[PDB]
Amino acid sequence: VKAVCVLAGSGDVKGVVHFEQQDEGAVSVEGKIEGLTDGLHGFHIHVFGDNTNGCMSAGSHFNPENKNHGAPGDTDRHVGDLGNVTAEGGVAQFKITDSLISLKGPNSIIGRTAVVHEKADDLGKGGNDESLKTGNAGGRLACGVIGYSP
């Protein structure tokens, strides 16, 4: 199965992210996001595919396994915790593989929202309660609803 999202927001940040999965195996994520300031930016799947109030109506992180916020490599993470992407020269181009997200079944991210954040995700190690919820990633620069692609 293949899926895609077009990211847009209130400013100039925009991008495209592609997703692919064979069988019920890992999902391959490839994207390009333009308009970011240099450095790390949190990249997460939020629960709702609702863009009626911009990125704010996407809700919190997708967390069907009922864990705290973490890094992609941790056992204690949300399904939607895909870590940080790195921007240089105003662009982030990335390829990740993840085994917790899916394009089918209960952990399906189809009809959910991908969000790129203002600040780096602290990966649950920030020393405060917010770190265990959002990684202190701040504002939502751009987002899109994930749909089926050819």
Q: What angle do CA 132, 42, 112 make, to 5 degrees?
A: 85
What does the alpha-carbon distance between residue 53 and residue 33 come to, in Å, rounded to a whole number? Answer: 21
What does 125 bind: its own copies, Cu ion, Zn ion, none (CB cut-off 5 to 8 Å by kind)?
Answer: none
Q: Is 117 a catalytic residue?
A: yes
Q: Is 25 in the site for its own copies (CB under 8 A)?
A: no
Give the residue with the Cβ less far from Zn ion, 17 or 81.
81
Q: Is 112 in the site for Cu ion (CB under 5 A)?
A: no
Nearest to 63 by CA among 75, 45, 50: 45
Give the range of 36-44, 65-73, 79-87, 108-116 binding its own copies by CB under 8 A.
Answer: 108-116
For 79, phi then psi, to 5°, come to -50, -40
The DSSP output letter for 36 is P
Q: Is 140 a catalytic residue?
A: yes
Give the range of 27-35, 42-50, 71-79, 125-133 binding Cu ion by CB under 5 A.
Answer: 42-50
What does the alpha-carbon distance between residue 108 and residue 96 come to, in Å, rounded to a whole number? Answer: 17
- Footprint (CB under 8 A) of its own copies, residues 44-103: 47-52, 57, 59
Q: Looking up tokens 């973490």, which residue turns up?
A: 70
Q: Which residue numbers belong to the known binding site for Cu cation?
A: 44, 46, 61, 117
